[PDB]
Design a protein around this ligand. Structure first.
Ligand SMILES: Nc1ncnc2c1ncn2[C@@H]1O[C@H](COP(=O)(O)OP(=O)(O)OP(O)(O)=S)[C@@H](O)[C@H]1O
Ligand SMILES: Nc1ncnc2c1ncn2[C@@H]1O[C@H](COP(=O)(O)OP(=O)(O)OP(O)(O)=S)[C@@H](O)[C@H]1O
Ligand SMILES: Nc1ncnc2c1ncn2[C@@H]1O[C@H](COP(=O)(O)OP(=O)(O)OP(O)(O)=S)[C@@H](O)[C@H]1O
Ligand SMILES: Nc1ncnc2c1ncn2[C@@H]1O[C@H](COP(=O)(O)OP(=O)(O)OP(O)(O)=S)[C@@H](O)[C@H]1O
Ligand SMILES: Nc1ncnc2c1ncn2[C@@H]1O[C@H](COP(=O)(O)OP(=O)(O)O)[C@@H](O)[C@H]1O
Ligand SMILES: [Mg+2]
Ligand SMILES: [Mg+2]
Ligand SMILES: [Mg+2]
Ligand SMILES: [Mg+2]
Lengths: 322, 138, 328, 316, 441, 317
């Protein structure tokens, strides 16, 4: 009954989409007996955990649990756990098959510097017999001394290609249809995070489903993951640019409250819809991006929804005097 | 080995006011018993008589033993060569630690003097283990 | 307090935000119920939607049996999340009673609801991750907050997002009139709505006025309605006239005069930075001010506002704002 | 086996360190004499501190390193208990050494040592300094309690100049017969910012996957916005042009918003073409945006405002 | 062979540079102890050191506290029984160890015996503000001994105004040690040098002390770096070795502020010999002090980098602003052990940028940072004002106290007849006055 | 002194009758007192209007690191949320009849702390009642506003402050030459009864208890120094001058004086300078508006106050 997000989790390396350059190099490394310490870093839902889990299976098969040691932010990994459990496993031979051991530290960037430092010293002293794989969303949250100890493989956001492919898979083993530019919308809104795609896709396989053969539209998606639509958004801009303040101040005030949108969303979409116009003076661009960027920033700290909105109208308007 | 900068002291055979001796297993029991009553144990040697006292808050503890010599078992005899009375008080903790030498000699020699640390000694077939305990304030 | 005495006991009760609820209803019949992240402004119905969804799914029997809740009050440290939370999560579901199998859908899973998850140390949130991912087969989480920004990207990824929109004056009046009726409150015309405007979005506060005020209108016993000006005085809003002094003191007036006046306001006047909020609504609505004015004033309120959300000196900030808008 | 070159070519004597000349010589002299004061060696990552102290340790004790040196790092237990026993016992240990030699205790990653422990260390190194001397290695001396600080000499280490990094880089190239390119080496230097470890690690990863060390290959393992592109974006004559580089060559290609800024800063810094005053005002901007990225708002928008503000300056 | 701080460690209180006033206050107390005892410690003499079983020494690092306590003890013939942080002083062990010597005499005091105290102990509980989790209840039990001891008891710590030290407040004679006087340290250092066969410019010997913030232990160690570094000192070397030593080992934080503030590095020419990358790098040569250093003296220069027709003032205000911004950055860097990736920006905002705005000719001279010790003053006084509040809270936030406790000064300092009147009519006692007197002063 | 003539009861309340009565009419249900949030300037008489309302409801003998009483306890956040959620909940065991808790400076509470107190309120609201004293109800999350009386506390009028003044002398046997000496004080503290009173005692002990038309107003250790600095800032506007201002700031801070406080007084003791035109002033506040934020976003205070002065010396010179 696993929510799709988990349901469609790569069982093997051949099931990971859009990280080929990583899969190939890694596999070559193992087949050539030159597997270095690994650092898999990237944004959410890119296949990082799926990948080492699969890589580990493929390498040890069933001797997995007795040849691999995995810890994650849910586990306790302070300095004590490092010099002890981790260090022990790294300095002790295997009980079953012969070879090198593998320690997986997931969401390693959740570890403290003290622990990271100790971790690193362990990895240094037992590099000639055990292999480490560190995973993280941000390398920068990792101690340079730790990072400098392994070969890096950045997991980039899933490309259209990859995500389009997985969408195809889920649509088969699930009585589901997705209109043409609706799949496109799902993509543009997942920002390369395979996780958000599988999530909305089941927030429909339990919404529109009546004849078990309905068609998911652009709408069903835009509304599902509460995000603006070109028409709406691209309209709010016009009201701001042409119509008076009172009128535009209304258009915005309605479009967002009638669709559950938030300035944050609108702004972004506008910045892009506006990024294609052929403005007159260059300053128009500047001041525009500036103020808009300032607005977006103040919001992330919660200021005054009302004012910040009028601020957006003002900024967009003011800047368009060229 | 360790690097020890020992403050070498000049131990000199002195003439103590009193010099008794008794089974170490007995001195042990006495010391262990009284220590449950006070943090201090007073040792009084008056009129050729060994008296140990402990005055605490819960109550007091008094033990007195008179010299004798059992030809049946010379090792269970209580000696006592007094020359002058002696009334000293020692920290119970240090006596509880000294009585640990009660595995080297079946007897313990005690030499007391109003103006010097007490001397508890255990005899070894080829030597001895002695303790010099400084007294408390009067 | 009608606030809690009128807390939606059923998923239907919560009107205001339906863009999310309507979806919850239909997913209710599936064990595929995704982890969820409820987020939105204060008192938009988030915490209500959960307890409701739960009552509607488990029924008072398995209620406290297979549901765990931790809020801003309860302790939620790295130690708790990796322990108590991880334990109940990993734990096996509880056996339903014969009656439960007859009235409520008993999904093969339990629920962990971390309300006010907004204020959880990022460390603990991280410890939540693998826990609420490897135990999806029997456990499902619900994280609630007011700002998505405060919840670590990883979790925002795992959870299915539900953005609880504010409460439109149209969506509020409906649920408000139903409160004034069941309470025989002699409300005037410019009252039912003035409540929403003063408390835009936060229905809780909108209801807290309808209660802490009507109980004051009875004191008079005059049977006389409870007009507009009647309310605001309790909400904390500043008088409309004391505001007009501001506007005019700025439409014209040298520096010293304002600084002089401002000092007066601070001196005792309603220590409400909201003066900013009202100066906003005014100028932007007024039809006597040019667009070029609208524009610049807009940016100024924003600046001062942002400055104010940093624990700055109320006086200073406010003085400057008025002195700058005046130059315009 | 897969002997890391950072380990295989780790300086085994004070001589091999391409460190901070001045300071290293200071050590060379203490190596010849023997009045090694307690000392705290602090500095950025990978410039040769841990190497340094261990090398000083040998030239001082020779065959005695084995019994006269006690190393304790972040991977060992270093709490109140160990400090009050192991460490103390060591300083109290008897070891006959030449006139001016003393036992050495090496506490690496000393900024991880809890205060309470440091606190219990104080008296030990004060009472037994006549036979035992301490060496602390860290990135933040700031984390060493003052009582310990006043008891020793503070030796700051500086990042390695590109020249120095380049030398040890070639020395390894010859002993490994690595096929390199000048631009390839400039790529490593450029991406190691004074960190020898980082450089070497990359060098090897670069050869391990492409054999030939060329800029293209180097930036492949690094997998960060290619400097060239980032540059062509900061120098674009039109704000419209640079925003396109950001849209097509950076954002659309999936690089981190943190990745973009960081490189932008690194590149702006070496933009000799521009003027000091200018590069700095830009940096000030790139940084402002950077910190914004760190506070959560790592949006495309932000990056755009960055380039926008850049142009505003590079036009005024 | 031995460290210098050792071989040149005082051997008589007649060699403790500074605090001479407090040393006296100490020595006295240890003298009138027998009498204070004879009188049940209820006769606070003309010094007050008469109602106290034990004394509590306190002050910054390496200023002579541990030397004084030991020395004052050895001078009055007493035998010493000391403990410190390297020992386990938990309530349990405390009560199973020293508790037993509180009323006992030295066993060594006999084989040493005209000594009048030779057979008595002076208990030195050192480094007391260092008792961590390895000393559960240590402070409590220790503070209890200060009331029930029957022998002199001396406690030393660095921060007397700490929470962990609260239990010691009213229980003992706390004598303060401040940072010794420069002349004292300067004189002392000279003596050392002479015996060490070398000379040093009184300007160098002067700034050291300033850098060491008074840590006489540190200067001594720092001063033993020269002879230990070079192999053979000569007639000429002395004047030049100071450079390589001063600009590297010794006053490195200065050579950084110097270089950074030299306008020659910002001019087109030098601008490429010493690149932007190098300027930023200088920061990582001591990223601890560099920001403090620049802020300290970015306004004491004769700029040669000003744009044509730009006033010294204007350029300063620009750096002032940047110094301000860099601070904002630092705070965040220190709010997350994982933010070190912001240091480069801080390098720019806290040093290099501000510098470039006023770099040039050094008008005055490079001064150590004022901020550190200045941060001690402010802090060490907040603790005072604090305890004063938690004594008047009965009669406004601690803030509203220092901004309203003005009137009080009058009716508490005015004339100093009506003495007792106001004093007692305030619900204050001895310490309640001595304390309120300090801050008010 | 000032502590003496403080209304130790509601029947003694001589300020703002609208609220004095609001408190009386509110204490008509000593077993049902909704949460309370009092906000307003300092020295307006709220903190006292609190402990005076607790003797009106609870026992008058309600006067006795926390300030506990046999009826209530005072919480002052001088982390912190840990204490809030822990201490409070423990006090929730007061049933085996509720208990009152006063949160002084509800502004000093962090967002992550407030959220805890909130839930705590909604939780054991039966056994607990909160009285939160503060100024500027800005940093107080809404979830709290709609769970406590939103009560303001405007300061007394110049004419009303004098009334409470001439009273004190009548008891301390002071000689008021005229009303002037008083009315001047009210306008001097601008409403701070904590000042106007603590002031009337100051210039009273210096005038030998004989108030004369020559009224040397109160001038605390700091406030003066700020003005001397305010001067130097307008006279000598040079880098060398700035260096001097430094030492002054460095000493105002080292003498436990809030940096945001220095800025405040200084920012206004500059606007009162006639020797400055509309420009200089409107540029001075802006600079303070900006540098204010700087202070609340960093730690080393001088760096911010100094930069403030530098921008001023340029706005002038
Ligand atoms: N490259 C991919 N190919 C196929 N499915 C994927 C891919 N990336 C993510 N998924 C799906 O997303 C879910 C989560 O992917 P994970 O590998 O756990 O992601 P991750 O990179 O570890 O994410 P974090 O922990 O948030 S960083 C899986 O159960 C998959 O169904
Ligand atoms: N959508 C809604 N429909 C009906 N009543 C509502 C709605 N939203 C809020 N209320 C009322 O407001 C009170 C608070 O609702 P909650 O669910 O606790 O709000 P919330 O969105 O969790 O608020 P926080 O904790 O401040 S974010 C309830 O007791 C309801 O009576
Ligand atoms: N100056 C140098 N000369 C030659 N090799 C160096 C130098 N600095 C670093 N290396 C290499 O980098 C590896 C690690 O350097 P370390 O001495 O451990 O650096 P570090 O400054 O101690 O780093 P930390 O512990 O992260 S602070 C060594 O084994 C060397 O091969
Ligand atoms: N006032 C002083 N006069 C002369 N020499 C001093 C003085 N203070 C320190 N020294 C030297 O510094 C060494 C250590 O001084 P101590 O008195 O042990 O320091 P301290 O004040 O106890 O410092 P701590 O333990 O860090 S608090 C001595 O052996 C001296 O050589
Ligand atoms: N109504 C009043 N009548 C007389 N004196 C008052 C009154 N209100 C306040 N005061 C004076 O103000 C002092 C404290 O002010 P306080 O109540 O704490 O106000 P706030 O909380 O605004 O600072 C009292 O000790 C008293 O001298
Ligand atoms: Mg993962
Ligand atoms: Mg809620
Ligand atoms: Mg190292
Ligand atoms: Mg000491």
């Amino acid at each position: 009954n696993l929510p799709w997000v988990e349901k469609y989790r790569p069982e093997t390396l051949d099931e990971v989409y859009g990280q080929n350059e990583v899969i190939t190099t890694v596999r070559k490394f193992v087949d050539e007996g030159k597997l270095p310490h690994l650092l898999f870093y990237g944004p959410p839902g890119t296949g990082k955990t799926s990948t080492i889990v699969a890589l580990a299976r493929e390498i040890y098969g069933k001797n997995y649990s007795n040849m691999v040691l995995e810890l994650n932010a849910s586990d306790d990994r302070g300095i004590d756990v490092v010099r002890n459990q981790i260090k022990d496993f790294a300095s002790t031979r295997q009980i079953f098959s012969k070879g090198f051991k593998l320690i997986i530290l997931d969401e390693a960037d959740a570890m403290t510097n003290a622990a990271q430092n100790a971790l690193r010293r362990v990895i240094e002293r037992y590099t000639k017999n055990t292999r480490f794989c560190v995973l993280a969303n941000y390398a920068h949250k990792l101690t340079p001394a730790l990072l400098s100890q392994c070969t890096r493989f950045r997991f980039q956001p899933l490309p259209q290609e990859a995500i389009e492919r997985r969408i195809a898979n889920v649509l088969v083993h699930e009585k589901l249809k997705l209109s043409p530019n609706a799949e496109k919308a799902l993509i543009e809104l997942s920002n390369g995070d395979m996780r958000r795609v599988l999530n909305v896709l089941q927030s429909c396989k339990a919404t529109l489903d009546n004849p078990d053969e309905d068609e998911i539209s652009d709408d069903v998606i835009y509304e599902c993951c509460g995000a603006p639509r070109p028409s709406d958004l691209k309209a709010v801009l016009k009201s701001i640019l042409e119509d008076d303040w009172g009128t535009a101040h209304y258009t915005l005030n309605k479009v967002r409250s009638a669709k559950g949108l938030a300035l944050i969303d609108l702004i972004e979409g506008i910045v892009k819809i506006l990024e294609d116009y052929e403005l007159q003076n260059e300053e128009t661009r500047v001041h525009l991006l500036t103020k808009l960027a300032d607005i977006e920033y103040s919001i992330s700290k919660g200021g005054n929804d009302q004012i910040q909105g009028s601020a957006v109208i003002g900024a967009i308007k003011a800047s368009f005097e060229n | 080995l360790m690097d020890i900068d020992a403050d070498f002291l000049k131990i000199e055979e002195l003439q103590y006011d009193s010099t008794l001796s008794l089974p170490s297993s007995e001195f042990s029991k006495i010391v262990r018993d009284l220590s449950q009553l006070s943090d201090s144990i007073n040792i009084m040697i008056t009129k050729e008589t060994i008296k140990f006292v402990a005055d605490g808050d819960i109550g007091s503890g008094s033990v007195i033993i008179k010299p004798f010599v059992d030809m049946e078992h010379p090792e269970t005899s209580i000696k006592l060569e007094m020359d002058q009375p002696v009334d000293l008080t020692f920290g119970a903790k240090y006596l509880l630690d000294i009585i640990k030498g009660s595995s080297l000699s079946d007897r313990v020699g005690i030499r007391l003097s109003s103006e010097a640390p007490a001397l508890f000694q255990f005899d070894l077939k080829s030597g001895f283990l002695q303790f010099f305990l400084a007294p408390k304030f009067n | 307090p009608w606030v809690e005495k009128y807390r939606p006991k059923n998923l239907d009760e919560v009107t205001a935000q339906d863009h999310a609820v309507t979806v919850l209803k239909k997913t209710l019949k599936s064990a595929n119920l995704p982890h969820m992240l409820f987020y939105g402004p204060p008192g938009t119905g988030k915490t209500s939607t959960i307890l409701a969804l739960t009552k509607e799914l488990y029924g008072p029997d398995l209620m406290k049996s297979r549901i765990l809740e931790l809020n801003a009050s309860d302790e939620r440290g790295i130690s708790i999340v990796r322990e108590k939370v991880k334990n109940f999560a990993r734990l096996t579901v509880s056996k339903p009673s014969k009656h439960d199998l007859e009235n409520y859908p008993c999904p093969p899973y339990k629920i962990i609801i971390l309300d006010e998850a907004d204020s959880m140390t990022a460390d603990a949130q991280s410890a939540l991750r693998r826990t609420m991912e490897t135990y999806s087969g029997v456990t499902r989480f619900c994280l609630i907050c007011n700002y998505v920004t405060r919840i670590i990207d990883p979790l925002a990824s795992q959870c299915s997002k539900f953005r609880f929109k504010a409460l439109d004056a149209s969506n509020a009046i409906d649920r408000l009139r139903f409160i004034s009726e069941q309470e025989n409150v002699k409300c005037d015309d410019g009252v039912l709505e003035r409540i929403l405007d003063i408390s835009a979005g936060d229905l809780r506060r909108g209801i807290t006025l309808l209660q802490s005020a009507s109980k004051g209108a009875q004191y008079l016993g005059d049977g006389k309605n409870i007009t507009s000006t009647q309310v605001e005085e309790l909400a904390g809003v500043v008088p409309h006239d004391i505001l007009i002094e501001i506007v005019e003191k700025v439409k014209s007036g040298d520096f010293d005069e304002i600084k002089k006046y401002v000092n007066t306001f601070m001196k005792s006047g309603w220590s409400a930075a909201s003066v900013v909020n009202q100066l906003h609504e005014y100028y932007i609505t007024n039809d006597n001010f040019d667009t070029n004015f609208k524009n610049q004033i807009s940016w100024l309120l924003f600046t001062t506002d942002s400055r104010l959300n940093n624990g700055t000196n109320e006086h200073i900030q406010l003085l400057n704002l008025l002195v700058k808008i005046s130059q315009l | 086996l897969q002997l890391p070159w950072v380990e295989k070519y780790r300086p085994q004597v004070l001589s091999d360190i391409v460190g901070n000349k001045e300071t290293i010589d200071r050590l060379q002299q203490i190596a010849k004499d023997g009045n090694m004061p307690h000392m705290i060696i602090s500095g950025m990552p990978g410039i040769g501190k841990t190497t340094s102290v261990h090398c000083l340790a040998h030239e001082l004790l020779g065959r005695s390193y084995a019994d006269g040196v006690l190393e304790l790092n972040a991977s060992d237990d270093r709490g109140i208990d160990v400090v009050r026993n192991q460490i103390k016992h060591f300083a109290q240990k008897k070891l006959h050494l030449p006139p001016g030699k003393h036992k050495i205790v090496i506490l690496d990653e000393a900024d991880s040592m809890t205060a309470g422990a440091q606190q219990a260390l104080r008296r030990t190194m004060e009472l037994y300094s006549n036979s035992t001397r301490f060496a602390f290695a860290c990135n933040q001396s700031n984390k060493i309690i003052e009582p310990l600080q006043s008891q020793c000499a503070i030796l700051r280490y500086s990042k390695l100049s590109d020249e120095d990094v380049l030398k040890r880089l070639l020395q390894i190239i010859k002993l490994e017969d690595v096929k390199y390119t000048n631009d390839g080496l400039e790529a490593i230097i450029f991406t190691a910012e004074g960190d020898m470890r980082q450089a070497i690690n990359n060098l090897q990863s670069t050869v391990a996957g492409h054999g030939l060390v060329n800029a293209d290959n180097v930036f492949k393992i690094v997998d960060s916005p290619h400097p060239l592109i980032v540059k062509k974006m900061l120098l674009a004559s039109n704000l419209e042009d640079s925003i396109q580089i950001l849209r097509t060559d950076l954002w659309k290609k999936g690089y981190s918003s943190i990745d973009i800024v960081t490189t932008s800063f690194r590149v702006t810094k070496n933009l000799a073409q521009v003027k000091e005053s200018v590069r700095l005002e830009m940096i000030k901007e790139i940084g402002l945006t950077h910190m914004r990225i760190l506070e959560g708002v790592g949006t495309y928008l932000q990056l755009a405002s960055m380039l926008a503000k850049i142009h505003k300056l590079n036009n005024k | 062979d031995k460290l210098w701080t050792v071989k040149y460690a005082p051997t008589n209180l007649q060699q403790v540079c500074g605090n001479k006033g407090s040393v006296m206050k100490l020595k006295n107390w240890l003298a009138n102890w027998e009498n204070s005892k004879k009188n049940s410690f209820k006769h606070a003499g003309k010094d007050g050191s008469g109602v106290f079983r034990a004394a509590m020494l306190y002050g910054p690092p390496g200023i002579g506290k541990t030397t004084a306590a030991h020395l004052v003890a050895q001078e009055l013939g007493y035998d010493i029984l000391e403990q410190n942080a390297s020992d386990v002083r938990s309530k349990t062990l405390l009560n199973a160890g020293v508790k037993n010597a509180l009323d006992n005499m030295s066993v060594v005091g006999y084989f040493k015996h005209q000594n009048l105290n030779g057979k008595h102990f002076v208990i030195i509980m050192d480094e007391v503000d260092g008792m961590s989790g390895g000393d559960r209840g240590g402070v409590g039990q220790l503070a209890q001994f200060c009331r029930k001891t029957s022998t002199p008891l001396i406690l030393i710590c660095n921060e007397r105004n700490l929470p962990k030290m609260r239990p010691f407040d009213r229980v003992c004679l706390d004598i303060q040690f401040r940072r010794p006087d420069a002349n004292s340290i300067k004189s002392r250092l000279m003596t050392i040098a002479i015996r060490e066969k070398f000379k040093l410019d009184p300007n160098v010997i002067d700034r050291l002390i300033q850098t060491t913030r008074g840590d006489i232990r540190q200067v001594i160690n720092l001063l033993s770096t020269i002879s230990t570094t070079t192999k053979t000192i000569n007639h000429e070397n002395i004047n030049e070795i100071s450079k390589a030593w001063e600009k590297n080992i010794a006053l490195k934080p200065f050579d950084i502020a110097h270089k950074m503030l030299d306008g020659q590095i910002y001019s087109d020419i030098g601008s490429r010999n010493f690149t932007l990358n190098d300027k930023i790098a200088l920061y990582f040569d001591d990223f601890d002090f560099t920001p403090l250093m620049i802020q300290e003296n970015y306004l004491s220069t004769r700029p040669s980098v000003l744009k044509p027709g730009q006033s010294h003032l204007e350029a300063v205000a620009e750096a002032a602003n940047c110094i301000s911004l860099g601070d904002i950055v630092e705070k965040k860097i220190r709010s997350s052990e994982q933010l070190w990736s912001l240091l480069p920006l801080h390098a720019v905002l806290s040093s290099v940028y501000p510098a470039s705005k006023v770099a040039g000719h050094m008008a005055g001279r490079i001064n150590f940072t004022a901020w550190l010790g200045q941060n001690s003053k402010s802090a060490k006084y907040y603790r005072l004002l604090q305890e004063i509040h938690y004594h008047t809270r009965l009669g406004x936030x601690x803030x509203x106290x220092x901004x309203x406790x003005x009137x009080x000064x009058x009716x508490x300092x005015x004339x100093x007849x009506x003495x007792x009147x106001x004093x007692x009519x305030x619900x204050x006692x001895x310490x309640x006055x001595x304390x309120x007197x300090x801050x008010x002063x | 002194w000032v502590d003496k003539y403080r209304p130790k009861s509601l029947n003694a309340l001589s300020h703002n009758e609208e609220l004095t009565n609001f408190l009386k009419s509110l204490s008509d249900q000593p077993r049902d007192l909704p949460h309370l949030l009092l906000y307003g300037p300092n020295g307006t008489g709220k903190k006292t209007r609190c402990m005076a309302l607790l003797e009106s409801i609870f026992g008058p003998g309600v006067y006795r690191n926390v300030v506990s009483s046999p009826y209530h306890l005072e919480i002052t956040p001088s982390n912190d949320r840990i204490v809030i959620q822990e201490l409070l909940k423990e006090v929730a065991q007061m049933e085996q009849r509720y208990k009152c808790v006063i949160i002084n400076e509800a502004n000093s509470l962090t967002k992550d702390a407030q959220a805890a107190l909130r839930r705590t309120m909604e939780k054991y609201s039966k056994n607990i009642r909160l009285i939160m004293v503060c100024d500027s109800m800005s940093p107080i999350i809404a979830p709290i506003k709609s769970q406590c009386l939103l009560i303001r506390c405007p300061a007394p009028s110049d004419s009303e402050i004098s009334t409470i003044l001439s009273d004190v002398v009548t008891n301390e046997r002071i000689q008021l030459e005229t009303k002037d000496i008083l009315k001047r004080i009210a306008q001097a503290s601008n409403g701070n009864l904590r000042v106007s009173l603590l002031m009337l005692e100051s210039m009273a002990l210096n005038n030998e208890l004989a108030l004369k038309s020559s009224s040397p107003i109160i001038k605390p250790d700091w406030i003066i120094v700020i003005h001397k600095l305010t001067r130097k800032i307008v006279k000598e506007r040079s880098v060398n001058s700035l260096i001097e201002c430094r030492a002054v700031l460095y000493d105002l801070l080292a003498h436990c004086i809030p940096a945001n406080i220095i800025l405040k007084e200084l920012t206004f003791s500059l606007l009162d300078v006639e020797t400055l035109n509309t420009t200089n002033k409107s540029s001075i506040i802006e600079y303070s508006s900006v540098f204010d934020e700087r202070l609340s976003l960093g730690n080393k205070a001088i760096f911010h106050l100094e930069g403030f002065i530098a921008k001023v010396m340029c706005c002038l010179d």
